[PDB]
């Protein structure tokens, strides 16, 4: 488990790990909010912006793509001093920008899990790691997505992040052989 877990011991970050990190997410919305809360990453640690999911959820409609989607520059302005999240203007106006983006993407295809989980052919994939240094940080698959969904209209969602995101929603299963919390794939 601490090698699969890149051997912190926060036991937040561990909770995360352990019962989120990898586990299959099939539900559009869930996707949404955690898409979304990667992109406040860049610069910061991961735990931080854990520690503040519950204020970016008050900020962001509770990460609702339909009530996000439609935030203006006068909302942003608010949430420059909201308590809590990251002050951070881009990374702000990013989250708005990726609602628009989900609304758009459900209106030309479907649903937005069903376009995800496309790029994984509707179940995970299996990286089969046994060390936590056979861990790569960003593929082809991952580089394409990002580019894909930048045409949407998404923001702050490069190759690696996105990469990040498919390990943290399951798309993409990294959890060591070994660990505890490596999901059943059938
Ligand atoms: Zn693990």
Redesign the pocket.
């Known amino acids: 488990?601490n090698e699969?877990?890149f051997g912190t011991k926060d036991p937040v970050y561990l909770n995360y790990?352990?019962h989120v990190?990898?586990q299959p997410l099939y539900d559009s919305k869930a996707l949404f909010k955690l898409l979304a809360l990667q992109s406040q990453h860049a610069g910061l640690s991961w735990l931080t912006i854990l520690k503040k999911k519950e204020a970016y959820e008050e900020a962001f409609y509770d990460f609702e793509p339909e009530k996000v989607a439609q935030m203006t520059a006068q909302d942003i302005d608010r949430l420059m001093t909201f308590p809590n999240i990251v002050h951070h203007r881009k990374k702000l106006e990013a989250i708005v920008n990726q609602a628009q983006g989900y609304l758009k993407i459900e209106q030309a295809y479907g649903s937005f899990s069903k376009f995800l989980w496309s790029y994984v052919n509707g179940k995970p994939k299996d990286l089969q790691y046994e060390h936590a240094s056979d861990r790569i940080t960003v593929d082809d698959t991952a580089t394409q997505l990002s580019k894909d969904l930048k045409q949407y209209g998404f923001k702050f969602l490069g190759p690696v992040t996105v990469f990040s995101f498919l390990e943290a929603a399951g798309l993409y299963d990294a959890?060591?052989k070994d660990?505890?919390?490596?999901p059943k794939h059938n």
Not at 179 to 182: A, E, F, L, M
Request: charged share 15%.
């Open positions: 488990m699969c877990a790990h352990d990190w990898g959890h060591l660990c505890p919390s490596k």
